[PDB]
Amino acid sequence: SQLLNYIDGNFVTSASSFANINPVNGKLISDVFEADAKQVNEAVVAAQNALKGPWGKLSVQDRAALIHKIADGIQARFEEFVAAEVADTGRPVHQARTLDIPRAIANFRTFADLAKTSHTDLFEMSTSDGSGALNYTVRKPLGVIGVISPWNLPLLLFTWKVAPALACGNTVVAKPSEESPSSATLLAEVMHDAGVPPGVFNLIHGFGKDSAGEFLTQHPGISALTFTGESKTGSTIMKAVADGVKEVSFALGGKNAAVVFADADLDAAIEGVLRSSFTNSGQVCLCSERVYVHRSIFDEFVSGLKVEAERLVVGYPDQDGVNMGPLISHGHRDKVLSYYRLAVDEGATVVTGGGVPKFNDERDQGAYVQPTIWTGLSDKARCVTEEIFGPVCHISPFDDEDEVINRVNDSNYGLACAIWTTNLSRAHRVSRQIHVGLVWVNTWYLRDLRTPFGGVKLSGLGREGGRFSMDFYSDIANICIKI
Amino acid sequence: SQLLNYIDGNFVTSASSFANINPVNGKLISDVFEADAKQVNEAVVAAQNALKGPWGKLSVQDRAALIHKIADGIQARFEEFVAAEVADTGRPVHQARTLDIPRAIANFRTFADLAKTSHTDLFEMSTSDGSGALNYTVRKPLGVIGVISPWNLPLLLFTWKVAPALACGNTVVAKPSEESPSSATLLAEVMHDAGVPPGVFNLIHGFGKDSAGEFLTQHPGISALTFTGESKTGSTIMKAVADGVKEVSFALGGKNAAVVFADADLDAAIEGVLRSSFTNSGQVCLCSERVYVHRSIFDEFVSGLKVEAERLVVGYPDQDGVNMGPLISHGHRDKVLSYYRLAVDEGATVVTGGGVPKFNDERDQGAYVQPTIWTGLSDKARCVTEEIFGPVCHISPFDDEDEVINRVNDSNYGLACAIWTTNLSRAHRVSRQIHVGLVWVNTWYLRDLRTPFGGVKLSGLGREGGRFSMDFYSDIANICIKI
Amino acid sequence: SQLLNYIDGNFVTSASSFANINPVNGKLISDVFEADAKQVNEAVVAAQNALKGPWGKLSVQDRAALIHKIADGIQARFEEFVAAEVADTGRPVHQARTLDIPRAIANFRTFADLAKTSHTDLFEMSTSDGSGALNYTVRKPLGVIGVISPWNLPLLLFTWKVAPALACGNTVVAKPSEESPSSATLLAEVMHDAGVPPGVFNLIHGFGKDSAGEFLTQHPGISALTFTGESKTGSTIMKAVADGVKEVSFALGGKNAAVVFADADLDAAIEGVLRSSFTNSGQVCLCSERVYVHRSIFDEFVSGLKVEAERLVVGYPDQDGVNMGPLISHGHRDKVLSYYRLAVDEGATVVTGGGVPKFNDERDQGAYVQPTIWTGLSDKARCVTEEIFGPVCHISPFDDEDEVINRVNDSNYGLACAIWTTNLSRAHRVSRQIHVGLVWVNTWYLRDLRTPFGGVKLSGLGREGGRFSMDFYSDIANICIKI
Amino acid sequence: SQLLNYIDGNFVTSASSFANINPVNGKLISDVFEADAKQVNEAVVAAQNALKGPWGKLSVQDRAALIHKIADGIQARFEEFVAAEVADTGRPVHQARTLDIPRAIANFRTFADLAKTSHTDLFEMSTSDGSGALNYTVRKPLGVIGVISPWNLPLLLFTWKVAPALACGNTVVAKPSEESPSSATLLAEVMHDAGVPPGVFNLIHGFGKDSAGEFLTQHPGISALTFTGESKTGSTIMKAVADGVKEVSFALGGKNAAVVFADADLDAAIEGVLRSSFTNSGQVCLCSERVYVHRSIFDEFVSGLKVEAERLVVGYPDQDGVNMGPLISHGHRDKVLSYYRLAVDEGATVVTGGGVPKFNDERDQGAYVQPTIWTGLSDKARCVTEEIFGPVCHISPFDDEDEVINRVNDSNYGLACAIWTTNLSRAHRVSRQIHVGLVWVNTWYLRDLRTPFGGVKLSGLGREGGRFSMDFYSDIANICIKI
Ligand SMILES: NC(=O)c1ccc[n+]([C@@H]2O[C@H](COP(=O)([O-])OP(=O)(O)OC[C@H]3O[C@@H](n4cnc5c(N)ncnc54)[C@H](O)[C@@H]3O)[C@@H](O)[C@H]2O)c1
Ligand SMILES: NC(=O)c1ccc[n+]([C@@H]2O[C@H](COP(=O)([O-])OP(=O)(O)OC[C@H]3O[C@@H](n4cnc5c(N)ncnc54)[C@H](O)[C@@H]3O)[C@@H](O)[C@H]2O)c1
Ligand code: NA
Ligand code: NA
Ligand code: NA
Ligand code: NA
């Protein structure tokens, strides 16, 4: 497999290539061409010029129709996209088929629709002379949108940025994670085949520092940088665009808590925390890595979770009852195992897992680890405060509602929280006091694309979703007419 | 010993003080106590703690009432605030009485009212199990808001940030410009007398770099930094808060154009541009420093403007027919004069002004300059492209509509633009093509506080006003209930 | 006392007066002049004219300021207003003090504030010639608003229509209930002293059919009729305005259910149903005249309610621990007692009440009845289906959730419903299935003036509240500009 | 050809039929089965029942997809729908191809989209106990929607109601005009083939009084009646549904003015008024039957319009350059010619037209009239005040802006107005002062489906379009949770 850049309507190679590796078995999947600074410049310039071409002349309705055409194109090649996400990342085929690909299609359709229905504001005012004035606002394309995405839900998170950028009439230069370049490259093929004018969508491959990613962030030709990834990367990028005062939108790390109250439906909470800790092998930004369970049900909760975690099937993405694939890469597994060791050093009881499974086949050359549960750590332990991004959670008892609220909030992160309780008052009273951008009550990772999405503190800045994306990806202009 | 900080409900001095100078005569007005890093920390911590006191417990209705009381407090001491603004800035008394103070009061009233009327969103969704789920959003206080403000419209711009900050339930640490500290200090006394709880509003005085401004910018305890000032400073601030990923809102420099078409009302356009160029002695972010006039009316427009400029009275804030006061400081005057010289060097024709008036009295010790009109520079001249922020404008002829639109847009700034034309189609067709956040047609500086306000490119990041402020100064949380 | 009409800025008498009876003791409170057709027309013509006077020239900010002055004016004669409502209706003094009057003031203040903050819409569209078009909307005064109101919460319900009517720049012709004309007459005094331009607010006294009410409804000079009263009266008025195609807003009768599930907090539910049943002696449209209680807790619930019910103090508005006053009138008691009998004939067990109290003083000349609880009736019984509007409820057991939902919904009415449960899923699942405009969970008659308020089926049409009022009381116009 | 009813998923005949006539030549097109009261009852009951079946269980997204399939089905049989509208009404083929059928399709697509993107409101409130409460609103299906539509733009106006009705989850019983039943019947075929569940959409054929229309209007099983037609018919229907207090939405007659100011683009205005007067042979509710032209250009405008009118091709729907077809029916022509006579009797000068064209072929048995222009009548003449709904306009001079605004507003109707001017201030100043629901400047009949559409005074009640439809075709319910 060879993955090229896509710049100004053409697929192009580069003077440097890097390997895409399958985490299931450590084998080479494809060669990826790393865009250099010159090619990043070429992509931004094409994007700037495309804003002045046919793309810029399309009516909102025609633009939306084209975007639905893009979505049709992905649907027409549904299984090729499934194969690509799975190859790159080792995610179970079931997850790619039911969540990943359909959601990436839903991203384009939802924002295309929003573009058609969205409107702006009219403000009347009085004036001295008594003839009055009108102020009206309009949404216009912001310009060239730089998109930089992570490896954990490659096409879903890529299209979550690209869909609204295009729906708002911008042009795009997007850099997917070096770990997961395939589905973004296939999407470039879909764009090309759907007749998207050259320069409107540009795909550049590579790394961050001193590579495609950094060059993009440094280019004076962009109008905004939207980013999803680690918090420290977010800070680095915010500094990079500071001189250009570029618009910025960041969804970043988390150290998410799940709270199980005594009045929770216990089997449901056990199933839910099992899903929220170990889905995608713990590699979702929304995963719960800290868990608080009322003292009265703590022991029973921990026993039940141990049992369920130990029935999880870890293996091939298309294996019968598979629950978990491997981690994204050997490098990431090194980091995760290092955290496994640190937890024992910090005094943790290992309730289950804590190592890597032994398959006695090619999977042993992959990047697998065991779902892991810890107990007995203090709230200030590193393993309870730092984002690990693997299939793990620490469980701690609590006694009081105000107590557990303070403990959930005692964090430099603030992305998401999940609360389990059958009590009406408690659900609402407690949810509003959690210092995060997203709370789920009695469920996890249900997403309505209309809702505002983002985090607080180190977990981000700004919101995307529904009208928040329509506002971020547009110039909002106010036009005032004296009458 | 004149102007103190107000930290945790107490006026306090500092280790060192600095002089506040009257730009009308160069005389000492007051000594100002410069907060140190230690006092900056004390202020941020007090603001953090106030979030958890009685302020955090007020209903939105009671909070709004308390804010109207602050407004009533300013009103009760109207002339004292007038005297303070006039002293610091040399502002004509009439304009402080009619524009500055009433508008500072309106800031508090408008956002109090908005806080009471604002609501959020309810999203219903279907789920696999057929029972559904509810997503709803809430606005909560973001936390501690760091406010850094400029000297040009001291109280107006200070309250423009402080009003929505408080209306949204935040606490505040605000640093007014070293050049204009008085009206903000009086506002501290008004907050005190109205019984605003300690820690909710904190005033710190000082400079930027290596002083109170920088320190506020670097404190990990704030949740957001909203700033009005030079673009250079915006960039500097964006880098400072990057490690904390703090929310940012920037309204920065401009090099605003006025455009006068042949079908304009010529007398109204001359009067309009006179105001947009020379109001507040050209020291408003929204002033026009570039003017494009259709060739058919150019000579007449220039001759008319020269006549009206030379009828402007430059003098004392209480001088009978006074139109213009001094620049803010000798330092700013030096910069403006350096541009006056550059302009000549660049080949400009000085239509009028170009120097400093000779008063033969104490005003000669102040910081006055002449309202100035240039002609003959190219679009690439420094004086045509760099923000001067003095009472000046260059006037250039134009021939075509697409031409002038391009010349207006050919700037690294994009704050505002004024268009003069009587033609229905042209007004709306041209206005939408100008790459700014704010367009006025047949007027200038008409402000409705409900409208989105901000700029593009180097002129800013984000929007404030109406719901945009209610959103910026709030944590937006989504809460999803599985049924 | 003497109650005059207020027409074109003048208090005026008429050719006929009628008696205002105090129902505490049957004494004559005042004579009320009955507007005749000539006076009604005179009122409508003045309101029409007033639209082109100073009122119509007021900015929205000035209009809201005056409206707040109306509110200030009520606050300044607060006790006079309490006295008035109490005199007319027998309402407990505490209740008029803390609820009735403050809320009438809140009506003006809230709609004044909404008027200032409300805005409209801008829609951009592409056109064949590639130049496009703009559609914008504006709210304008609808014109002359006819207001006809009931006797149960005189000032509150009066001002609920008058406030938004005036806040939207309309003029008003208002016909208060013949039973409760006092507080409205006082308000006319407040309007006058506040300086409300003559013709802007007109008060007309009289009855419905063949009287002022009817004449108002038949007048071609009004633009809308907003009504609160009996559903049959609503249908009558609907036919009256049909030839003129007038805009209509109806809040009509109900036969509201309270539902108590087994997982309710029983003590709070007992207290809640006590209030929803007997507040204002059961003379609120929102009262629960039907109650369904889970079988498992039915007997305990009835016993608790009986006890709490028998603790209710029925006497003087000023009497010490007073809980109930009399019904509004002897005529109304005749109807209520007639139902008391009907319930017996129908098979009801009288758990408590069912007659009239005995005072051996002037009150025996009043219009008092006993708080009553029935049991043992069929869902098809008249007493359980028809609105009584007295301090009465029937309690029936239920077993299944879908069963009780069906029984609540089995009604030609559909105003409000109260649900008692501590279960999260249940609260939300059941509430959405109740076919009414207003559901309360674990409380009753909590009112936020921003929310949409109204009923379904016979209980009304349209919604008022928040933007629904801003919409109903304005002309919405769409202006389309071809560019 | 035979047109059956569609009831509960079955095409059904009836006891009696009536003839559908081609107005082009007076020939029989089809026999149409007239629904009787018994069949109307079956339809309504099927519709109530369908709300409780599969239709009522669809997610909003699945409902929207099914509605896009309905639209697809119309698209797939596009030319059959064209032929049907033309046969019924004599509409030029070009207009049916470019305007009539594409809009019918757009109606379904737009409201399907609005249904996916629409959301409701969250209101937080404080309470005495300090724990607070939530109010959230939801949109539910109103229930069974009765739709009665007119003959002028049959499928367009029919689907304008049926689309939002279904998009909002209602079931429908629809009665198209007796003059134009074909496309509605084809629409029922598309519904059937698309798999729309039985009872969801029901088509009943017949007349109004003493027929299907009247019976639908009287059935207590409907929840709303939405109507487009004559004002007097609207009044009749309003009385009919009054005992049931049914929600109603009316779009009724007009007597629309066009105004041509001295600064208009004269040739553009002549062409505009030509179109607004004679499109669909003057048979659009939005047509201009009154025209006011500035005195300075009156004679030239009138001479210009005469020439352009006499250039119109009146003939067969597929005739080479055809501009106008016949009126809908001989009955309607009888009324139109009656007004032609009356105009003469009232003292009108006939500038052109005023009779019937003579074809000397089968068209002479049709219902054609000549496009007609009058001059010289008083503002009080009946021909200038009463809706004719033919291809006619009267033209009168004016001098002053306020003068003409008053003359336009001096009507019992208030649907629309077209204004012609090149002046920015005038466009906006004059448009806001016209008492109508819709103004166009320098164009006519430009429709954005997101905009509020409707009239004032006799021209209607309520608004439809965008969120106004989403609100009208839904139950708005407020749910209040005590926390
Ligand atoms: N919605 C959310 O908040 C959300 C969602 C998913 C993942 N995340 C976070 O993403 C992280 C995991 O993804 P990741 O490991 O790929 O993050 P990674 O930050 O370290 O980098 C992600 C992307 O940024 C690029 N990049 C790295 N350094 C750069 C630089 N100096 N300049 C420009 N670009 C640079 C990378 O090439 C890659 O495309 C986790 O921390 C996770 O929590 C957040
Ligand atoms: N939010 C609500 O829906 C709400 C609230 C409170 C009370 N109500 C209803 O109010 C009713 C009690 O008040 P009511 O007894 O005064 O109703 P009442 O209908 O018989 O009359 C109310 C008003 O209508 C006038 N009126 C009567 N006949 C008229 C006619 N033919 N034409 C014009 N006007 C006429 C009356 O004079 C009075 O001003 C109850 O049915 C109750 O349900 C509704
Ligand atoms: Na890979
Ligand atoms: Na100073
Ligand atoms: Na009375
Ligand atoms: Na026909």
Numbering used by the authors:
A (entry chain A), B (entry chain B), C (entry chain C), D (entry chain D): 18 to 500
Give me lines lifted from the publication on this model.
One enzyme in particular, 2-aminomuconate-6-semialdehyde dehydrogenase (AMSDH), is responsible for oxidizing the unstable metabolic intermediate 2-aminomuconate-6-semialdehyde (2-AMS) to 2-aminomuconate (2-AM). On the basis of sequence alignment, AMSDH is a member of the hydroxymuconic-semialdehyde dehydrogenase (HMSDH) family under the aldehyde dehydrogenase (ALDH) superfamily. The complete AMSDH model includes four polypeptides per asymmetric unit describing one homotetramer. Each monomer of AMSDH contains three domains: a subunit interaction domain, a catalytic domain and an NAD+ binding domain.
To probe the function of Glu268, we constructed an alanine mutant and found that it exhibited no detectable activity in steady-state kinetic assays. We determined the crystal structure of E268A co-crystallized with NAD+ and refined it to 2.00 Å resolution. The overall structure aligns very well with the wild-type binary complex structure with an r.m.s.d. of 0.139 Å. The active site of E268A also resembles the native AMSDH structure. Interestingly, E268A exhibits completely different pre-steady state activity than the wild-type enzyme.
